[PDB]
Structures are given as structure tokens and as C-alpha cells.
């Protein structure tokens, strides 16, 4: 619910190759990096089952190559929240026939992008399951 501070897909070199601040109210590319730094540096590819930072939900994940960040508020249950996060790995994996890689990332961004807008759009998750998508999309 207009609830994504950003969803970022971050490299684990603290880099971010995706960020959409769906919702935002703080700025700076730097501050974004800084903010990123404290937490990323700290989580350092390691993640947690759950993590709350800022009273805010941090659901983040890692892949086998990439670090997934979503920032949200601990003010909206894990199970769902994760479900979207889950949705993110999985569909990308199946559809593409391949999940995220650094390589994958490097060849083309777009698909992520395409997906992303569809799934979520700002601080409101319009959707969180693949299938609909799968049919819906045909690129």
C-alpha cells in the first residue's frame, strides 16, 4: 500500500543495479548509497530469515549471485511480503528458464524492469504470483 520504499536489486558489491524507490521521501544517490552501506555492509551477502531495520521491515534476500532488497515497514506481515519477494525469484527463474545471475544481469536489465512495473507499481503491490503474469506477458 504505497508501501515500497524502494526495492532494489543490489549487487553484493553494495552496488545497486536496480532501485526504484517506489515511494521515497529521503534522497541523495549518495545517501541512498550510504544507507545502503550501513545495512549492506553489515548484512554482507548474508541476510536474515527476517530483518527489521528501522521498525521497518527489511526483507531482503540474496540469490546465488545477487542481493535483493526490499524496504518496507514492519507494519505489514512477513508472509505476504515475502510472498512477493518469492514471486520475484521464482517467476524470473521459470520464465526466463533462468533465475538471477550477475551474468544475467549484465546481459540485459529490461526484463527485470518489465516485470517489476507489472508486479508492483510504487507503494502498492498490485500483484505477487507469477502465472497471471506469465500469460500476461509474452515478450
Amino acid at each position: 500500500l504505497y508501501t515500497v520504499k524502494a526495492i532494489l536489486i543490489l549487487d553484493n558489491d553494495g552496488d545497486r543495479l536496480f532501485a526504484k524507490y517506489y515511494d521515497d521521501t529521503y534522497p541523495s544517490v549518495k545517501e541512498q548509497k550510504a544507507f545502503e552501506k550501513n545495512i549492506f555492509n553489515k548484512t554482507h551477502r548474508t541476510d536474515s530469515e527476517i530483518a527489521l531495520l528501522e521498525g521497518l521491515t527489511v526483507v531482503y534476500k540474496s540469490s546465488i549471485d545477487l542481493y535483493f532488497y526490499v524496504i518496507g515497514s514492519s507494519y505489514e506481515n512477513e508472509l505476504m511480503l515475502m510472498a512477493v519477494l518469492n514471486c520475484l525469484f521464482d517467476s524470473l527463474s521459470q520464465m526466463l528458464r533462468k533465475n538471477v545471475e550477475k551474468r544475467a544481469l549484465l546481459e540485459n536489465m529490461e526484463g527485470l524492469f518489465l516485470a517489476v512495473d507489472e508486479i508492483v507499481d510504487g507503494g502498492v503491490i498490485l500483484e505477487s504470483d507469477p502465472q497471471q503474469v506469465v500469460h500476461r506477458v509474452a515478450l
Partner: protein, 798 residues
């Protein structure tokens, strides 16, 4: 990498017709990438880009249709024109590539404007409403950003508008409701009848449920009415399904028991607790911290041990580590187990999911439950704290020290003893600064001089001009106060301990020199650093000068009356004031609606039981949420039978003027309507001071002598005072007496011989002999030193 430049040049690619969707798309992609990564640039170029891009648009090249959406999408609350597409939007609108249509509208809406708003509208209406769920969704999202801006344009449509929200897809159903988050922001009543709709049907989206919960909950705090059945109803509903989140959600708030609900709910909860109890919902941790609150009830507590023991045991899962601290805390602990744990902790804390942070939080809680208190623990802890350490204690210390002060701890001798020592050989200059400052104030109120000195010397012992310096500064509050031996010696010491090292020399010299400069006693001082309540109201009232008599206020209102009921636009609370001569009703308020400001305001009162009516006063202007004063004035007749208790009839008159709150307008025109004004009744307690007599014996009789009226009733269906009692103590506001007041939850006989003095000076006196034979027959006397009161009391008491 990113950079704008290639691309602007590269815009000439637009010039080709032989292109591949891929080829261009990529180029398009490149620009978008710089940006996805981040870019910043000029409008001119953007505008240009548009044109350039825009330029291309023969095709339906589908792919082409998307990219632009993006592109455009990039611009929304910080845009550049709107018009250009327009055609293109319409083109979709008649044009069945369904798909496409939806993305485009959506961007526009942060970017929007009102004229242009006009545009979509008949259709739009349709459109939101239209067909396949998919399309409809697309429609929705679009508003919201426009809602930022506004959305009321929409809003209006509403009686009619909502009904379409009626759904047949889950996902959708969930969605409908948030828009209703703002809808319910707008309205509460609506919900209520509404709920019975929400309540009415079982729901689809777990998701839909959730918003309701918050809400539902939100409602509950003060009570969501007789949640009994609803709460219950709900209770199942939250309770089970195939979607976990609800059960949990419900669970955390709902406890209820300090000697309260625990019934089913504890079992269900237990099913859950246990069920969760290994990261099903790693959620479980948070809850214990507050969401599902714990501070227990006594047998209840004992039961809790096992669950906490699992976490305590497991030591893993970030979600686990946190959980360990809250559960243990909330439920509390025995000393003994702590011991086992201290060792566990010894390893654990450093990183064990990065335990230190949870722990600092835990620790902050520790400092609080014992902030220098269970000092033995504080010391055990202290030893341990320092010990287990790392370094990370310091941070904690900032809290801990603070805690100790909060108590203003008293096993300081010991507490301090540990602190002092350890800190010495637990280092960090920084801590010292803080503590110094505090200590600085405290000194000889807590004695133990030799020790304290003993310490102090040590603190200084350390090098640092700076470290040294603090002992002297702390000392000033101390010195000045002196202790169990200090003044003589205090004088001796500064002498005994002295230093060179220039600026360090200087510090000694200077303090001295400073010392040198004031009489040390003085030195220390500088450096170290009726005509009631209601009468006041008679005066407060006095600043006005339109009077037509007043007097001095005698007593004031026994109860202020809201003259407009609850949360009304013209919300009124009124207070009534009595003087020996006049009574003023001064009217307190919040011309409520931001709709209105009321102007040309005066207050009518029309009376039944006497007062001479001098004037109705109103406030000149009353804007929203802001007391202003209006008054109504009377002079009080005192020696008449029936002449100061009155009910007065109220009608509010005003010329009603509309507001723009943004920036208003205040103009001569606007038209009146008048609204009913609530009654004012005047009491026998706005006027009276309740008393004890100057001469009861005599007075008691005497008051009879001159004054006395009577009423008798014989009570045959009820043999209880109590009804009578409710009207009399309370109406008159006087004292029941002659040690003839008291009755337990029963009593055989009762007299109130009762007192206070009425306005206009003279007194109003009452004797109520209530007599129980076993019927009650009773003699009520009112006797008075004022004529108007005897008739009055008999009435008034009712």
C-alpha cells in the same frame, strides 16, 4: 556506464524506418538505464527527447508502445507538458489493443491538471468500471497519484460511486478496500453500516482482511462496541483458514486479562505460539515486545518458561535472537538461570546473528528493569558487562548510567564502587566525560567522603589535563556544599594539590585565581549557578464594558454545559457564573465546521423562573476551532419567591459565512440562518458556597424563626431515602450535617441538617429529617436567610 550524450546525438536513429524492435529498444533501454541507475538533466533536452521520440509513432509496434510508457513513466510529479499524447490516449480509447491503454493513463495522474481533468470523465467513469479485471486494475492505480494532488474530483461521485466497487475477484477485492482506507479516512459512520456489508460477507483476499483488521482493531481500542459477537465472529475468521497471517495479526493485540479475557483465546494463542515457536512466522519475535504485550499474572507466568526456553536454547535465527531477549524479559527470569545464560551469552553476543545489536536493545531493557536497582544484579551484570565486553558495552553504558540516575540509585556506594573501579580498567575517556558531568552535580548529598575523595584523586591521576580537570569541576558543586568533614579541609586541599604544566599550570592557578578573585563563599554561589474562583471569572469577564451590571462572583457553575452537543459544527460548551448582583453566562467554544465561520452572533435566552433580562451578547466573529466569547447577562432578583433558578431558551443567530481555509475571503455579504440554542438551566450551586455554620445551634433554630417552609411526603412504595438522596446532596451541593450525614450501605434513620450560603449574600438553609417508621414520612425544612431560597430548596433539591 551512463551518460546522456551518445543518446541525444543518437536520436537521429529515429530517422530510420529500417530499425529492428530490438535495435531501437535497446537504444531506448540505454537511456532508461542511465536513469534507472540515476541521471539528472535539463527539461529542454527532455522535451526534445520527447519530441524526438514522439516523432516516432506510426506503429502499433507493440514493443514500442511499452517503452515509451516507461519513458513517460519516468517523468510523473516532475513532468513536462501533457497534451502531446492526448490523441494517443484516445486512440487507445477507441482502440482494442487493450493492453496498452491501461499503462498510459496511469502515468498521467501524478502529472495531471483540472481542465484536463475534465477530459476523461464520462468515459473514465466507465473505464474504471470497465470489463475484465485486468483493465480495471490499471485504471485504479492511476488515481492514487492524482489523489496526492487531489482526487476529490472523483470523490464527489460517491453515493453513486462506491457501489460499483462490488467485486468478483480476490485480488481485486483486496484492492478496492484500500482506496477505502482513504474512503474510511473520509468516513466512520459509513463504515458502520458498511461493515455490516463487510461483516455481511465472508471475504476472499487474506489481503482484504488485513486492512480491515487494522481498522477493525483501530476501532476496538476504546471498544468497537459489543465486539462480543463480531469480535467473536472475527475471532473465528482470524483464527483459521489457509492463510496464516490473520490469525497472528489478531493474536497480538487481543490478549485482554489483567483479570480479563483469557478464555478460548489463550488456548488458540497457544496453538499458535507453539506452532510459530520455531520461525514459522519469524514474526513471533516482535510481538512479544509489545504487540502481544507481556508483564503477566502470577500462575500464568510460570507456564511461560518452556517456550522461552526453546528460543533461549536455540540461539539462532535473527528472528530467534531477538525473540530470546523479549520473551525472557517479558516473562521475566529467576536469578539462577541468568547465570547459565551469562556464560551462553559470553560466547553468543559478539556475532551469533550479530547478537550485539539485539542485545543492546535487550540491554537497554536490562538497564531499565534494573537501572542500578537490584544493584546486586546490577553489579553482577556490571562485572559481566565489562567482562563479556568486546568493547560494545560502552554504548550500553550510555544507557546504563542514565538508568541509574533515573532511579537516582541509592546502593551507589557499591554501585559507584563497581563503576569507579572497573571504569578504572575498563577505560574510555568518553564515558568519563558523561559521568563526570553527572557526578559533578551530585557530590555531598551522598556522602562517603574519604572514599569519594579517594576516587576522585584517582580519576585525576590519569594524565590528560582534561581528565584531571573534571575532578575539579565536579567538585565545585561539591565543595560548595561540603560534607561530613569538608569545609575546613576543602579550603586546605586546593592548596595541597597543585600543578604546573603551563596551561595545566594555569588551570590550577586560574581556578585558584578565580578563587583568589571571589570570597569563596560568594564564589561558590555565583559559579555554581462571595468573591470565589468564580470572582476571578467576575474580573475575567470585566475586560468587556457593555455591561449592564455584574457584581462580584459568588460561586460559579456546578457543571459547564455543552450547549451544542457532541462534535457539532458550532460546538459549544458553556459555563455559568454567579455574582451577588448579576449572573453572566459566558460561552466557550469552537465554531466547529471549517464550512463556517459564524458572524453576527448574539445569544438569545428566554427565562421561566425569574431574572431581569438586561442583554444577549454575542461574539462578533467565530472562526473554526477557536474559542471566542459570547455572553448573555442577567441581574439576579433575590427576595422574591421564585427568582434566580431559571431555564433560559436559546437560539443561535448568525449570518453564516462560508470559508476557503486556504486563503478565505471576508466580505460584507453572507446570509443568516439560525439554529436552535440549547437550554440553560440555572442551579442552586452556581451561587452558593456550602458551609458549616457561624452558629449552628442558634442559627439552626433561627433560620426557622424567620424562615421556614415545609413539605411533607409519606412514602408508601419504597422505604428508601436514596432516591431523595440522589436529588438532595447533589442538587444543593451542600454539606449534610450535625454529624448527620453518614450512612453505611444501610442505616436505620437519617437527618441531613445541611449548609451553604446563597447569592445576594443571604443564606439558604435546609434540614431534612428523613424519618423512617418503616415507611418513610419526612419533614424537609428549608429555612433561609434569603426568601427566594426556602421556596427554591424544596424545588431545587429535585
Amino acid at each position: 556506464h551512463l551518460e546522456k550524450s551518445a543518446v541525444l546525438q543518437e536520436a537521429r536513429v529515429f530517422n530510420e524506418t529500417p530499425i529492428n524492435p530490438r535495435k531501437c529498444a535497446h537504444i531506448l533501454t540505454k537511456i532508461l538505464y542511465l536513469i534507472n541507475q540515476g541521471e539528472h538533466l535539463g527539461t529542454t533536452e527532455a522535451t526534445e527527447a520527447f519530441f524526438a521520440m514522439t516523432k516516432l509513432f506510426q506503429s502499433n509496434d507493440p514493443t514500442l508502445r511499452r517503452m515509451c510508457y516507461l519513458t513517460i513513466k519516468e517523468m510523473s510529479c516532475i513532468a513536462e507538458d501533457v497534451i502531446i499524447v492526448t490523441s494517443s490516449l484516445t486512440k487507445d480509447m477507441t482502440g482494442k489493443e487493450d493492453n496498452y491503454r491501461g499503462p498510459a493513463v496511469r502515468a498521467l495522474c501524478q502529472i495531471t491538471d483540472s481542465t484536463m481533468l475534465q477530459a476523461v470523465e464520462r468515459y473514465m467513469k466507465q473505464a474504471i468500471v470497465d470489463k475484465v479485471p485486468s483493465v480495471s486494475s490499471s485504471a485504479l492505480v492511476s488515481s492514487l497519484h492524482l489523489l496526492k494532488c487531489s482526487f476529490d474530483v472523483v470523490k464527489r461521485w460517491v453515493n453513486e460511486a462506491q457501489e460499483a466497487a462490488s467485486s468478483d475477484n480476490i485480488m481485486v477485492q483486496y484492492h478496492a478496500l484500500g482506496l477505502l482506507y482513504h474512503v474510511r479516512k473520509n468516513d466512520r459512520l459509513a463504515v458502520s453500516k458498511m461493515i455490516s456489508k463487510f461483516t455481511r460477507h465472508g471475504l476472499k483476499s487474506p489481503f482484504a482482511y488485513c486492512m480491515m483488521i487494522r481498522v477493525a482493531s483501530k476501532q476496538l481500542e476504546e471498544e468497537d462496541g459489543s465486539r462480543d459477537s463480531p469480535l467473536f465472529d472475527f475471532i473465528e475468521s482470524c483464527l483459521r483458514n489457509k492463510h496464516e497471517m490473520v490469525v497472528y495479526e489478531a493474536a497480538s493485540a487481543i490478549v485482554n486479562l489483567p483479570g480479563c479475557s483469557a478464555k478460548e483465546l489463550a488456548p488458540a494463542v497457544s496453538v499458535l505460539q507453539l506452532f510459530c515457536s520455531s520461525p514459522k512466522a519469524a514474526l513471533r519475535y516482535a510481538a512479544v515486545r509489545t504487540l502481544n504485550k507481556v508483564a503477566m499474572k502470577h500462575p500464568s507466568a510460570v507456564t511461560a518458561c518452556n517456550l522461552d526456553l526453546e528460543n533461549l536454547v536455540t540461539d539462532s535465527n535473527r528472528s530467534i535472537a531477538t525473540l530470546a531477549i523479549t520473551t525472557l524479559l517479558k516473562t521475566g527470569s529467576e536469578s539462577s538461570i541468568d547465570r547459565l545464560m551469562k556464560q551462553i551469552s559470553s560466547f553468543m553476543s559478539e556475532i551469533s546473528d550479530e547478537f550485539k545489536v539485539v542485545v543492546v536493545q535487550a540491554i537497554s531493557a536490562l538497564c531499565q528493569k534494573y537501572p542500578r536497582k537490584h544493584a546486586v544484579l546490577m553489579n553482577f551484570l556490571f562485572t559481566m558487562l565489562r567482562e563479556e565486553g568486546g568493547f560494545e558495552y560502552k554504548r550500553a553504558i550510555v544507557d546504563c548510567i542514565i538508568s541509574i540516575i533515573e532511579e537516582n540509585s541509592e546502593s551507589k556506594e557499591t554501585g559507584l564502587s563497581h563503576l569507579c573501579e572497573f571504569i578504572e580498567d575498563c577505560e574510555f575517556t568518553v564515558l568519563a566525560t558523561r559521568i563526570l558531568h553527572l557526578l559533578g552535580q551530585e557530590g555531598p548529598k551522598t556522602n562517603n567522603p574519604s572514599k569519594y575523595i579517594r576516587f576522585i584523586y584517582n580519576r585525576v591521576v590519569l594524565e590528560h589535563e582534561e581528565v584531571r580537570a573534571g575532578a575539579v569541576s565536579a567538585l565545585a558543586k561539591f565543595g560548595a556544599q561540603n560534607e561530613e568533614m569538608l569545609p575546613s579541609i576543602l579550603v586546605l586541599l586546593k592548596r595541597c594539590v597543585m600543578d604546573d604544566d603551563n596551561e595545566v599550570r594555569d588551570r590550577a592557578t586560574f581556578y585558584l585565581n578565580v578563587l583568589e578573585q571571589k570570597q569563596k563563599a560568594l564564589n561558590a554561589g555565583y559559579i555554581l549557578n462571595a468573591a470565589t474562583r468564580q470572582e476571578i471569572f467576575q474580573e475575567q469577564l470585566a475586560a468587556v464594558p457593555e455591561f449592564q451590571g455584574l457584581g462580584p462572583l459568588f460561586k460559579s457553575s456546578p457543571e459547564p454545559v455543552a450547549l451544542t452537543e457532541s462534535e457539532t459544527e458550532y460546538v459549544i460548551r458553556c459555563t455559568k457564573h454567579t455574582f451577588s448582583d448579576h449572573l453572566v453566562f459566558q460561552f466557550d467554544c469552537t465554531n466547529t465546521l471549517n464550512d463556517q465561520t459564524l458572524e453576527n452572533v448574539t445569544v438569545q435566552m428566554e427565562p421561566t423562573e425569574a431574572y431581569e433580562v438586561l442583554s444577549y451578547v454575542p461574539a462578533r466573529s467565530l472562526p473554526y476551532n477557536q474559542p471566542g466569547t459570547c455572553y448573555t447577562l442577567v441581574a439576579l432578583p433575590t427576595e422574591d419567591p421564585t427568582a434566580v433558578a431559571c431555564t433560559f431558551s436559546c437560539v443561535m443567530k448568525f449570518t453564516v459565512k462560508d470559508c476557503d481555509p486556504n486563503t478565505g475571503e471576508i466580505d460584507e455579504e453572507g446570509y443568516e440562518d439560525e439554529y436552535v440554542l440549547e437550554d440553560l438551566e440555572v442551579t442552586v450551586a452556581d451561587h452558593i458556597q456550602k458551609v458549616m455554620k457561624v452558629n449552628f445551634e442558634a442559627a439552626w433554630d433561627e433560620v426557622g424563626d424567620e424562615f421556614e417552609k415545609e413539605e411533607t411526603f409519606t412514602l408508601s412504595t419504597i422505604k428508601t431515602l436514596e432516591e431523595a438522596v440522589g436529588n438532595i446532596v447533589k442538587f444543593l451541593g451542600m454539606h449534610p450535617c450535625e454529624r448527620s450525614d453518614k450512612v453505611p450501605e444501610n442505616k436505620n434513620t437519617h437527618t441531613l441538617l445541611l449548609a451553604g450560603v446563597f447569592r445576594g449574600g443571604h443564606d439558604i438553609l435546609v434540614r431534612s429529617r428523613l424519618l423512617l417508621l418503616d415507611t418513610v414520612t419526612m419533614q424537609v425544612t428549608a429555612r433561609s436567610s434569603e426568601e427566594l431560597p426556602v421556596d427554591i430548596i424544596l424545588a431545587s433539591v429535585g
